[PDB]
Swiss-Prot record:
SUPFAM superfamilies xrefs: Trypsin-like serine proteases
GO molecular function, one term: serine-type endopeptidase activity
PROSITE patterns noted in UniProt: TRYPSIN_DOM, TRYPSIN_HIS, TRYPSIN_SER
Organism taxonomic ancestry: Eukaryota, Metazoa, Chordata, Craniata, Vertebrata
PANTHER family xrefs: CHYMOTRYPSIN-LIKE ELASTASE FAMILY MEMBER, CHYMOTRYPSIN-LIKE ELASTASE FAMILY MEMBER 1
Species for this entry: Sus scrofa
Function: Serine proteases that hydrolyze many proteins in addition to elastin.
EC assignment: 3.4.21.36
Co-factor(s): Ca(2+)
Swiss-Prot/TrEMBL GO biological process terms: proteolysis
Protein name per its UniProtKB record: Chymotrypsin-like elastase family member 1
């Protein structure tokens, strides 16, 4: 997250840190949202590669005991079938991870509430992107979970030539684009909490940013629109 601030430890309990280990050490690579005690929603491009992944719930400081963390292995990766590796423009950047065992719910580990099927917000709707991603374009991951205010930018505007053009699809949600606040590498897969009638809900799954930089004026951060995949989500969970 670029242009954000350290979030209060327990403000976003469904946020998880998706980590992989190819070598001798675990490394945070993406974000994710806990949707079931044994299911985490993330972005397909975060898990269509590496071989070993683990999710950390109740996490805050990646480099220090917050004493509330729970580590668990990912048993199965269910990437959306229409997803095309290395192709965020086409969309379908979503995947469900089945955890090795269920995490224990508490104040710091709660399920994320998803918006009802087909729900889309009015332009400039308040949202908050959260994650441990780069705090500066080409920078480094954040040690403490960050949050940045990113109002939605509706499709009519986001798909306009000066913004994202045809690159954005209606199955995606755009937020931010003021040139100061944005998601950045490492936030991918994490949630975009957007107010729906006054209460937050995980409306997006961080998917991509401009190649010219994370914070780019008129280049809002793009996320997979959760409400476009409710049935898909329910189908996966009903397929084991
Ligand atoms: Cl990324």
């Amino acid at each position: 997250v670029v242009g954000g601030t350290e979030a209060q430890r327990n403000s976003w309990p469904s946020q998880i840190s998706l980590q992989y280990r190819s070598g001798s050490s675990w490394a945070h690579t993406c974000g994710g949202t806990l949707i079931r005690q044994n299911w985490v929603m993330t972005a397909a491009h975060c898990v269509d590669r590496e071989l070993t992944f683990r999710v950390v719930v109740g996490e805050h400081n990646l480099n220090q005991n917050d004493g509330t963390e729970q580590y668990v292995g990912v048993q199965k990766i269910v990437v959306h079938p229409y997803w095309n590796t290395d192709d965020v423009a086409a969309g379908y950047d979503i995947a469900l991870l089945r955890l090795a065992q269920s995490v224990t719910l508490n104040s710091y580990v709660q399920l994320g509430v998803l918006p009802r099927a087909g729900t889309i917000l009015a332009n400039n709707s308040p949202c908050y992107i959260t994650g441990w991603g780069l705090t500066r374009t080409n920078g480094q991951l954040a040690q403490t979970l960050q949050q940045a205010y990113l109002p939605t930018v509706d499709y009519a505007i986001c798909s306009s030539s000066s913004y994202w053009g045809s690159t954005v699809k209606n199955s995606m949600v755009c937020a931010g684009g003021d040139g100061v606040r944005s998601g950045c590498q490492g936030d991918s897969g994490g949630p975009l909490h957007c107010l729906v009638n006054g209460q937050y809900a995980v409306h997006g799954v961080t998917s991509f940013v401009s190649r010219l930089g994370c914070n780019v004026t008129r280049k809002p951060t793009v996320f997979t629109r959760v409400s476009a995949y409710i049935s898909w989500i329910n189908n996966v969970i009903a397929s084991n």
